[PDB]
Symmetry: D2
Subunit: 211 residues, 4 copies
């Protein structure tokens, strides 16, 4: 089966506003837990007798349940890697001119975009994502209620904010706003800018996908 292993090199440390105490369980327990479960699902999915494809049924079937949780755990892995990977103590770099221009024409400006992201982060129960919609070529804010609920198909993630309670409860308890501000203070723009460059290059090959 196609198994995954955690990327320890992605673990943030000494962030401004987000303690190591908060990072520890988030990275070591939650993130790694999704990796472990995804692997279990892969093993069971590989067993044609356990996940019998001929018994596939929408009311209940081993195959169905495995596929349902596969999206939950895989997204749990991916989203966390995108989240931790873009955090550096005190932040780094700045959004590129190309990124600023796109945000300006699609969202209205950096000010409008930040407000939009904070709003989505406050309105959603799982994640708030700023990404490129490959179907329209526009930057969009996608809010998720869970790792696998409300995700837009095809979206290339640029900025990912975890709004699950475990992401901020150690430091801020019920107070989400100060956590969102802290997240913005530690954004590694070198990472985001690179993601954008790749996203745009990819979009050039994907334009007019639906004709």
């Amino acid at each position: 089966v196609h198994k995954l292993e955690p990327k320890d090199h992605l673990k943030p440390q000494n962030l401004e506003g987000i303690s190591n105490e908060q990072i520890e369980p988030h990275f070591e327990a939650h993130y790694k837990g999704y990796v472990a479960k995804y692997n279990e699902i892969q093993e069971k999915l590989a067993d044609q007798n356990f996940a019998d494809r001929s018994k596939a049924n929408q009311n209940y079937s081993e195959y169905r349940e495995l596929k349902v949780e596969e999206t939950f755990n895989y997204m749990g892995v991916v989203l966390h890697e995108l989240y931790f990977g873009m955090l550096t103590p005190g932040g780094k770099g700045e959004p590129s001119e190309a990124l600023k221009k796109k945000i300006e024409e699609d969202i209205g400006g950096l000010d409008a975009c930040t407000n939009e992201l904070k709003a989505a982060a406050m309105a959603f129960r799982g994640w708030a994502i700023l990404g490129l919609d490959i179907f329209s070529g526009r930057l969009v804010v996608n809010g998720l209620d869970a790792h696998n609920v409300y995700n837009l198909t095809g979206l290339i993630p640029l900025i990912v904010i975890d709004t699950y309670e475990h992401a901020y409860y150690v430091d801020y308890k019920n107070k989400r706003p100060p956590y969102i501000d802290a997240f913005f203070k530690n954004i590694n723009w070198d990472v985001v800018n690179e993601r954008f460059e790749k996203a745009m290059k990819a979009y050039e090959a994907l334009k007019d996908f639906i004709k």
Copy 2:
């Protein structure tokens, strides 16, 4: 606001196993209904007073509800366009050698892939999708329980099967299997092959997205 309009040129006709009687309400009522509602949401989202961003709240807020249904309706539009757009009476072309090779190494073969797709179509309440996962560069089968439930972020769709009851109830009533077979008989491989080419070119710019 960014409004959409239906793509009438995508409407299939005289399909083998899928009647015009079945296609009519699916295209004219359902598909166009998602376009209309998406547009309404865009207008309301543009009104900063109605969708007050400062009032964003996860328990309930006008902003939240609009963003939630935005994903439902937008995916409803996109998925339907990908669905209708790949159907031609009696089918057309054949899967490219490049596509067959990728399926072979990622899924195990055309036989394994067809079985996998039919299984997902039988196991899921909304859609069954074969697409390219930009995070691993592998073809994967993604089942959805609704337009916006269980979608994998970043997935580039190649083959999309609608499993909503309105998609086959006119012709087959509760019988989904014969509908799935009929779908396979009308696949326009020229469309799918092109999608694959673009998907692979896009992946080349996206490889090593997470480092």
Copy 3:
């Protein structure tokens, strides 16, 4: 295990506005399908080795998936039995004075209640229910997006309307409004009135549940 068997005596026939052609697959395929799957889940849940309780995990575990679908299928059974059981050709009886009075004080009147029910039936993707909320002792309209999504705990169902597409697609295709009107024409008020009497008697023992 605690198994169930379909209640064939509940099958409606010769309804006004709802054909036998529509009733057939709904009762014989869908309803009975939920009974069959619920039974399978019960058998697997009884096997302590398959549904290992010590391995219970929220990301994925055999125990979890079985419990998730148990609610889907059991509600599928119960809701359908309440639905079919209250339909008689051309309708029967009338709402009791006691029922009318409660509706009047809780909802505002029969006119307001009918409008409320039709609205919920049009707004929800699964079911529209008029029932007694045991926590407040008030009649409330509860809309569900699926058999097990948005259900209010403790609610005693009086009137249940199926809004799943399979419930009306044979007769009305995408047109839900005429189906809702037809449903109201075949309501067996003797059944509903009895449900109400029992619900109220039950509420008398349940009042002040939360102190």
Copy 4:
């Protein structure tokens, strides 16, 4: 409109294994937040122009969104009141003989029931409930992934365990098992026994609900 107010007298203090620091935000912020939002929804639902019933639509409509979140917030209120209301420092009383006998015949014994509850609490993302199913007259364990997801219609709650992360993150961080044990140490059996008595009396009026 029918508004609600928090029940301050339900706030637990000096629990064994669950600190006041943990209780504070749970009761003062989360619980009271659901009460506030439910009230807002009631006001907006009362405005026939805002929540226009004639515009009821399942893709999106003000009426729909309000009804969706109404279940989220109302259940948030009710479930929390049942949760806090059954907690006393060090626990109190013991399960009645009547309760023990029912558990014995329906579940298999106190030992089996405790194991079942802990399993459901570990397998579900929102709540784990032991209640009386009015349709079968049997005690059942109902797991929920959220306040309004997977709830069984008609269920009369006896024991309610909150598994949301905010319920235990202050004291145990990611460690849910020790929290579940602590919950069992503070159960006020006088409350549970009374709930059971009322539930059984109610069931006597509800037996043979579906005929």
